[PDB]
Write a protein that binds this ligand. Structure first.
Ligand code: CAC
Ligand code: CAC
Ligand code: CAC
Ligand code: MG
Ligand code: MG
Ligand code: MG
Ligand code: MG
Ligand code: MG
Ligand code: MG
Length: 758
RNA sequence: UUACUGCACAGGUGACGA
DNA sequence: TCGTCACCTGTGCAGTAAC
């Protein structure tokens, strides 16, 4: 019946008395806040300046007096609540404001972890993990047309290495290459400094410097990254460092796991509710009960979408709750029509790895047998092919080569293909040490580039994967096979969808931001992905081949109008038919872009048909969490004491925050990885207010389904493929744009139906 | 770069207004 | 240029693979 949130009701006054000045230029605001400081809360909104009196006594303020009622204008007190929460928690210094964010005053988890594991080191006290709480006052709608303000509690961990760089050098951590940040953050200045090249007297030598090429040892510390933590502590702790991380994991789980998080939120509410919260001298707020999403009595705030069905035939008869279980039984969705039943696959690999690659290829093509039931059949039988023919392309290249690996791979590929006839796909095996080389000499990207140019999609793979123990390898090979099949134009599966209307197009856009280093400014690229409603299931459409960020809204507009035109020709819509277009992204579109997109599509389809249009943003990092106290979780593994996903809402749970907003649970206890995995965070789904199609519950469930459409993996994706695929495309095409001899010429020819971006 | 998941840090950025 | 509310994107490390 009920999903509990991480938020509490805030009992506010019905009305607050305010003073208003017209203030068209908002630049005067900062100085005016400063003048009236301590005595007035000041807030700029809609060309006017609102003043709420906090404390009797001057300065005085000229303006028009007005009663601001909370039910009608909750943004005023919501804003004041941001400041009042800080003032209500005086013993807690704000590490950030709006939302007020602060550290636990005592708890420090590295010390606690060292004690539980029985470790120690004279430098351990300089490594800190401190619980970090935030309090976000948020407007929500307990029912349509009525707003309220709630305070939402979130918890993270601050990682910080306060150790002097001098003390870390001795001994004997190699600080070279490590990123380093300012120790005191001057207001509005960058934290990042650069990487450590060397340290001498009192100065650090920086490369990839953000400003000055050197900084005093006293003004810099290591950035609190997991990388720096692991580098430092493994050097200091050696064999025992693993004991510390697992202990640290247990510690953090004591804050993050379902019942532990619910308890921590409970405890925070009790603390906040102990006294009134002072909105002004005269005016008090009161933190009340935990906010719930339920269906009682006038509220309709929670529902459970049905299980997504993975579908493997056009009749809908062959379906399954799980991708792999389904693919195992039925084979792929397009098995009866799949053209290339004898694919020829080029295999490019370092000559020294021959034996390992053959073992991998055999496992891949012919399976691992019934001792490894996750991948028994192998690619050929799995997909219902007749066979796979490998043309072996060894490369004389060693891992120690870091400057000429890519040229050796590409020369070998060119020489092999020149005499080998036609290949339909490639597998490229990479040394770990080459995987993350800069792009000008990175063999992943150069071989990707060359083969794509030639119209040959690739599935690449790093040697540590090639060398996985069999129990892990079987799962690797599931994901490898699915993506490879789709790279061969295959359609592994679809997801259930019933009719509803005459045609439905979903287009997504995704962003990548590329640079050669953290110091070089990131360049933006976009990708576009389309999905069509099919007979009884969704079908993946075509994909963008151009990636320029500038003019991206024209790109969306042209994609949609082009597609609508073709859909109409193809399907021959009858007068009165209804067509729906949905847009997905991780950010909202501009109102002006929505107007322009809606105008153009409406004009393109014309007046014979009805058109519905929705613009949706999918958010991951918001302050909302769902707790299902009825959920006991599952054993961490068969069949232990520990449980995983305790209190995790079922997948497909959808809660109403407001008219335009839903929370969508995606990670159920089954999908939750381990006992220490935190209570999952739902996706926030938000409808653009200018949308003409308004059913955000439908749109939330549609997003859920599209999460199951990913052919990169048997497990669902973190975000719908309309966005996810677009990000992968934008990143690849963005990187390829800088690789010499790259051409997109085959993306819409040989690769038009290839899912080359997986 | 089989992936999924989590987290951390860093960079900032988007949308709405006047 | 501004205020205001909000959260996105990149990178690296670790545990696990919906029955
Ligand atoms: C209907 As329910 C609160 O179990 O998602
Ligand atoms: C000690 As407390 C900030 O969780 O109330
Ligand atoms: C699949 As083979 C190259 O070991 O015959
Ligand atoms: Mg206090
Ligand atoms: Mg406790
Ligand atoms: Mg099998
Ligand atoms: Mg290697
Ligand atoms: Mg009508
Ligand atoms: Mg891939």
């Amino acid at each position: 019946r009920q999903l509990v949130s991480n938020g509490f009701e805030v009992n506010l006054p019905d009305q607050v008395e305010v003073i208003v000045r017209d203030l068209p230029d908002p630049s005067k605001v900062k100085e005016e806040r400063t003048r009236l400081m301590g005595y007035w809360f000041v807030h700029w909104f809609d060309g006017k300046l609102f003043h709420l009196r906090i404390k009797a006594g001057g300065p005085n303020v000229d303006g028009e007096h007005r009663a601001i009622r909370t039910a009608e204008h909750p943004w005023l007190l919501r804003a004041r609540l941001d400041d009042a929460l800080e003032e209500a928690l005086p013993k807690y210094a704000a590490v950030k404001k709006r939302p007020f964010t602060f550290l636990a005053q005592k708890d420090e988890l590295i010390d606690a972890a060292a004690t539980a594991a029985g470790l120690s080191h004279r430098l351990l006290n300089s490594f800190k993990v401190i619980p970090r709480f935030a309090l976000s006052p948020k407007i929500y709608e307990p029912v349509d047309g009525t707003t309220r303000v709630g305070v939402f509690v979130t918890i993270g961990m601050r990682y910080d290495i306060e150790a002097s760089l001098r003390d870390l050098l001795e001994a004997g951590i190699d600080l070279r290459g490590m990123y380093v940040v300012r120790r005191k953050r001057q207001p509005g200045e960058r934290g990042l400094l650069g990487r450590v090249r060397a340290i001498s007297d009192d100065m650090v030598q920086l490369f990839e410097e953000t400003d000055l090429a050197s900084v005093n040892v006293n003004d810099a510390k290591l950035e609190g990254s997991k990388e720096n933590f692991t580098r430092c502590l493994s050097a200091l702790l050696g064999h025992n460092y693993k004991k510390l991380l697992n202990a640290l994991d247990d510690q953090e789980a004591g804050y993050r796991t379902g019942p532990r998080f619910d308890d921590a939120v409970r405890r925070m509410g009790e603390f906040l509710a102990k006294k009134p919260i002072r909105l002004a001298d005269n005016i008090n707020a009161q933190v009340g009960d935990r906010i719930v999403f339920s269906n009682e009595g006038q509220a309709r705030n929670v529902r459970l979408a049905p299980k997504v069905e993975y579908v493997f035939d056009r009749t809908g008869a062959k379906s399954a709750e799980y991708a792999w279980r389904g693919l195992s039984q039925f084979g792929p969705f397009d098995r009866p029509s799949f053209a290339n039943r004898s694919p020829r696959i080029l295999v490019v690999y370092p000559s020294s790895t021959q034996g390992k690659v053959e073992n991998f290829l055999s496992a891949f093509r012919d399976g691992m047998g019934s001792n490894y039931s996750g991948f028994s059949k192998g690619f050929v039988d799995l997909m219902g092919l007749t066979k796979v023919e490998f043309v072996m392309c060894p490369v004389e290249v060693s891992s120690a080569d870091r400057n000429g690996a890519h040229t050796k791979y590409n020369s070998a590929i060119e020489d092999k293909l020149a005499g080998a006839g036609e290949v339909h796909a490639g597998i490229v095996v990479l040394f770990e040490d080459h995987a993350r080389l800069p792009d000008d000499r990175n063999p992943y990207i150069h071989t990707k580039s060359l083969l794509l140019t030639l119209g040959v999609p690739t599935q690449q793979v790093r040697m540590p994967t090639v060398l996985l123990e069999p129990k892990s390898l079987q799962y690797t090979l599931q994901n490898f096979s699915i993506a490879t099949y789709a790279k061969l134009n295959g359609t592994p599966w679809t997801v259930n969808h019933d009719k509803a209307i005459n045609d439905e197009l979903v287009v997504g856009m995704g962003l990548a931001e590329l640079s050669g280093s953290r110091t070089e400014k990131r360049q933006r690229f976009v990708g576009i992905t389309t999905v069509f409603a099919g007979d009884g299931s969704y079908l993946l459409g075509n994909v963008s081949k151009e990636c320029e960020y500038e003019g991206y809204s024209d790109a969306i507009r042209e994609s949609m109008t082009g597609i609508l035109r073709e859909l109409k020709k193809r399907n021959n819509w009858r007068p009165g038919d209804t067509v729906r277009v949905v847009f997905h992204a991780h950010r909202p579109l501009k109102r002006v872009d929505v107007a322009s997109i809606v105008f153009e599509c409406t004009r393109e389809i014309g007046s014979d048909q009805n058109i519905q249009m929705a613009f949706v943003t999918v958010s991951h990092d918001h302050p909302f969490v769902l707790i299902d106290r009825s959920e006991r979780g599952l054993e961490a593994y068969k069949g232990s004491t520990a449980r995983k996903g305790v209190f995790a809402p079922p997948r497909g749970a959808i809660s109403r925050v407001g008219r335009l907003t839903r929370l969508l649970a995606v990670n159920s206890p089954q999908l939750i990885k381990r006992a220490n995995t935190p209570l999952p965070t739902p996706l926030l789904v938000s409808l653009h207010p200018d949308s003409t199609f308004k059913d955000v519950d439908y749109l939330a469930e549609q997003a859920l389904k599209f999460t199951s459409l990913s052919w990169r993996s048997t497990l669902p994706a973190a975000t719908p493929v309309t966005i996810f695929y677009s990000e992968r495309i934008a990143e690849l095409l963005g990187r390829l744009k800088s690789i010499p001899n790259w051409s997109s010429a085959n993306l819409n020819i040989k690769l038009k139906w290839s899912r080359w971006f997986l």
